[PDB]
Design a binder for this molecule. Sequence first.
Ligand code: HDD
Ligand code: HDD
Ligand code: CA
Ligand code: CA
Ligand code: CA
Ligand code: CA
Ligand code: CA
Ligand code: CA
Lengths: 675, 675
Amino acid sequence: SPLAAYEVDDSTGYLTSDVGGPIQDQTSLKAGIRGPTLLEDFMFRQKIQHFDHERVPERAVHARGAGAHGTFTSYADWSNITAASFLNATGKQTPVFVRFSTVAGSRGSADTARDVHGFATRFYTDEGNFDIVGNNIPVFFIQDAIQFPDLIHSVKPRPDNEIPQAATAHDSAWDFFSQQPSTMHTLFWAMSGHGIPRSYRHMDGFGVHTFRFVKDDGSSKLIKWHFKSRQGKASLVWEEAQVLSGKNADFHRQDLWDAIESGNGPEWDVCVQIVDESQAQAFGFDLLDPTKIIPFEYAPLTKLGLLKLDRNPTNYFAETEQVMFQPGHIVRGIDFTEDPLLQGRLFSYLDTQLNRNGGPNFEQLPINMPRVPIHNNNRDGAGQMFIHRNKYPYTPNTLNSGYPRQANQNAGRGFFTAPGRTASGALVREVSPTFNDHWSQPRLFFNSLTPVEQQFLVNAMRFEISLVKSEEVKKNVLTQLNRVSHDVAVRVAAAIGLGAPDADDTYYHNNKTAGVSIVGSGPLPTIKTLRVGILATTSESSALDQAAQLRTRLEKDGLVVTVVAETLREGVDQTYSTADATGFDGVVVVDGAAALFASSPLFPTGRPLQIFVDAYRWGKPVGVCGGKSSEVLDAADVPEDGDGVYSEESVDMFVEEFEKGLATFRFTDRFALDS
Amino acid sequence: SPLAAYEVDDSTGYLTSDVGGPIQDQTSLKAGIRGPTLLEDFMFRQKIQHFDHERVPERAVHARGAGAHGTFTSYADWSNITAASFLNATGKQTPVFVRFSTVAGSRGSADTARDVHGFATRFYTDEGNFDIVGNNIPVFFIQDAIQFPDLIHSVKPRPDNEIPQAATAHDSAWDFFSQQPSTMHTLFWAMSGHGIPRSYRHMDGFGVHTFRFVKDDGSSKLIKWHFKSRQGKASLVWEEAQVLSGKNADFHRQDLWDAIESGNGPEWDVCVQIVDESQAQAFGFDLLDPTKIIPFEYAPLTKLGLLKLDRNPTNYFAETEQVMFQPGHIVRGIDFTEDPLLQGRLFSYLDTQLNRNGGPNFEQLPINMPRVPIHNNNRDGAGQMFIHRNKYPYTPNTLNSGYPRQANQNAGRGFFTAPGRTASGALVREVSPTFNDHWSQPRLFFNSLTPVEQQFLVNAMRFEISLVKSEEVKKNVLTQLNRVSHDVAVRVAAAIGLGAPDADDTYYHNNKTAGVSIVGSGPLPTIKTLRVGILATTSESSALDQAAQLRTRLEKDGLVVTVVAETLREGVDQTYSTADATGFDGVVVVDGAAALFASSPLFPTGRPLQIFVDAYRWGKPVGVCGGKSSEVLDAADVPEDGDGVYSEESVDMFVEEFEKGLATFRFTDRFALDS
Ligand code: HDD
Ligand code: HDD
Ligand SMILES: [Ca+2]
Ligand SMILES: [Ca+2]
Ligand SMILES: [Ca+2]
Ligand SMILES: [Ca+2]
Ligand SMILES: [Ca+2]
Ligand SMILES: [Ca+2]
């Protein structure tokens, strides 16, 4: 609605200045034809001044990201647990905007870096804008907001040379992790496949903190936000992620964009765990501690409604870059908790938009505006876009009849702090002892992964820690890893040539929890949008017929099909020169193209075979369609009897097998395990 | 050392606020131990406010870059051609700071994107700061500064989705190139190896524009700046660059940093072509036209002095990010020309620092300060650091005795405009007809590359244009390419499924010029700093002994040696898990490791062999040392008799052959050519 009035159409008409004067903008005004440019050329200067000033500071964290518009729909009337208006009726729709992100990388860094990921949702409710500023991992590195600059300095590039971009694989980061043991839980998550998701659509969103749901009668409950993907959970493998960072730094934002443009807008079930106030310390840890989850088995999920993203921005800068989220954007029916991480966040997000926007009127940016009337006595500031009629903007007043009126629990649907909340004791800068177990939950997480998944995590740690130059930091890292799992410490130690310390079993246990494994979460529930590369050739006209037949059968099922050949022509989407295994979720070679899989000026040596080999090694469904073709499989050293390897002459039988493979998504039997 | 007055040491002492009050910063102040955070916690708020506000806008162009300090030394007394003080004596030293960059990518994008590259040099002279803001390519896309936002909007990401990062491989860019034919010359350069340099040290720098040298007696000459690399010219191949974008986005800045830290600081001969004013239109084009070079044969290079970079920054942000170059930073003895591109730049660089710095006192930033006194009547502004004693800052004054004094041609060593310069004619927004030949010099450039080099350029074009979705744009691209070379248009057309238009020979010629070929610029003159990966194993104690012996022999000659094996231990630098062929200029397998070249939980399947195969296909010197070669060479499909393939038992004989290979740098026989 506020976005509508600000849309600007330039599909017709003559070029104007910003003040509506028709102009030209292609040649400077000069003193003679070979002469110097004139100062009086206002056309030149308004244009270049605009350009010179296009850039704004990137966000201090979550700089790299992308967004889309959509809709949230409540499944019910939730007034029995919260007064929140956007949740007060079956079927009620509220517009949203969501921005997904990495954390550590700058603008222009690669989508498929290993990192924590942001998932930020604005609900433009009929009682004000409500932001849930979440991550794809349910726990956070630190226990007090005052530590955030310490964390972020450590994981961002070394400040002498600004190396390395968008990576925790350097001394400073592991120095911090090894010296601040709270970090263990999030570190384990980030080193799992949760650090390299297949897409923004294939990860979940978490509020992380415990919040409160507050009823109109003042009573409250403690809650965790969970956004559960309806597309299923899925990851890249690390080697794939690295190549993909170079071949397509825009992989995640292109995936999101394309899914929306094809009518496959991603969906999430917006859910909570709800527990009584008396359960703050019932589960063997403290619900004020943002390094802990409530295990699935302790508190079930309640589905509140549906989040769907279904429209892409018109202007990335105006909408995506300028959207300014705040946990301070709260509505009646929600309240904060005394989580020391959350508490400090409230300050940060209000302050940081002054940096980004360069002035205090950032909530007037159309993407930031609400969809209800604004009544308040805030005035002036740079970039003030309103013209206020109330000339007595103070309370209390008689000269504007006491308007605007105070809103509170009993008037005007005012926000109110949960009336049960209290404080007692000295004013201290001390950590609660209830926050001290940094290791049990990391172990819970690790115990809940499948064997190959645990191997992947060990291999990510081996990769990163092997890049750490300081022997002391490496020792220190092993000391912390050892407190979570001796086994992990032994396995990682083996790769970096140190001895693991002796087992210290204080926090060791064998318990598991459901819902945190990617590998173990079963087949994807939909294969729409998944990418199938078909490797073909122009040399055999039968190869293009085989590709065409495959295309029709696969596209029928909503898969995105790329036929590859030496050169472009009708039916061919990409050349071998531009193609890569990171571009596909499954790879099919047509029989007719067998000759390519053994030199050409049109593509680098061995490219067709390399795509097939890479896809196989990265765990993808691969196959040959045509029938007499032990060839290609032989050339690739891919076993015909392999899980997730397909050979059929029949196109229909091939597609039916292959689609089951796409759902399985990764064939993990192809990865070696430690003894 | 050069900015030593501004350094802050934190290697001792207790934590303070910014106003020197000792504090803590690890725990928020709270109302009880499980209580909410207090607004009175000033420790929290000053720390988080600083953090929230760390970021500044990235540069509008050349956002991604890196810098170092050094020294310029004049070879002579140049007062006979220029009054410039920093050039007025044999042996005179001036400190410098240089920043290299890409153009289009945002600040965390990959060093090894295909792009134009910046080379910006500040001389902190004894008569003021003098900046030469150059590129690694001697010509620019456009002929008028007013077009710059058109060019940069077209090559930067599409503004609806902000895709794709750091790449010209999309519709908008080729739409612009095909509709603005001036772009052809720079386009050809960027599609050559000049678009993917091996390092900042292995490229040249160019002022691009014609400037003037002005003597103390008012006479002037026209000049082009050339910075000639003393390390030699060298390129990546495109497939290599793509992988390297993912494996090491920091490749160029790490290369520069390491070379400096190892005592191998890169050097350039700072040179000019000098011609009389009467030659402005003598060479068949206009010296005011920044799309044209002066061919080497038409005007020789004069070496003015030596630029050496030999000290790395202390703080990246404070020095590299905050350095604010301007072509407006000129000194007595230099002057501008009526180049409409240059002319507009002068406005832009003064204005844009207001965006970056947020305030007008950006020249007071330590990196921007001069090394001589400032006397002027500029006052106040946000961030004013000076405390001025002159309380009569106006001219003319008697109350400060007429100080500061006016400086000009005849007093105070004032800058002065070259007195011979004039203007004549109407005030016009028209393009000089002398600028109209957009195609002859692109053809000159292309004619001057070796056959494999021409193929590479064709292959870059094939790659990019094949990614363009609009058939109309592709047709339009072929129309412009055809005006440069029919052959080029035919070869590119073959990859994208279209017929090239009929030959239009208006601008076709067979002239060549020296010095623009990378392939043809002979062997590198030094191999110091080049990277040699030695692939070994921990399974065989003889393989590590072979590696150690190779290390000693190679390090003796200044090469950077990486021994790779399954795991880290004494003498092993990297694991196979972290190694890649993009990490090395040459790859050596020790024959004790032959068993690895045919699965492990410690690295991805086939990684050892993949490193060798990739290095070979990317044209690098590769070899097996020990005398048993055939097993490794067979598995890799590398011929023993191949150019740049080495097999010797003798360590000394192996190294002697291999080092000649490193100098050759690339073995171009391994790349297929079009019929
Ligand atoms: C004390 C500071 C601080 C602390 C403890 C955190 N953050 Fe934060 N976060 C910021 C300070 C901040 C910030 C500096 O205020 C940012 C950058 C730009 C912005 O709007 O706020 C930000 C951005 C930011 C974004 C990007 C929103 C967007 O797309 O624009 C997400 C998703 C999060 N954060 C999520 C979290 C989560 C889940 C945290 C812990 C549970 C968290 N942050 C702790
Ligand atoms: C009309 C605008 C315009 C035009 C025609 C040009 N530039 Fe520019 N250039 C800028 C506007 C600009 C700028 C927007 O004002 C920048 C951005 C950041 C800065 O400090 O200046 C810039 C940055 C910039 C940098 C980065 C300096 C650094 O590392 O900080 C280099 C090396 C160049 N340019 C080089 C060139 C060359 C060789 C050009 C043509 C021959 C050129 N620019 C034309
Ligand atoms: Ca570090
Ligand atoms: Ca995984
Ligand atoms: Ca400002
Ligand atoms: Ca209240
Ligand atoms: Ca485009
Ligand atoms: Ca080249």
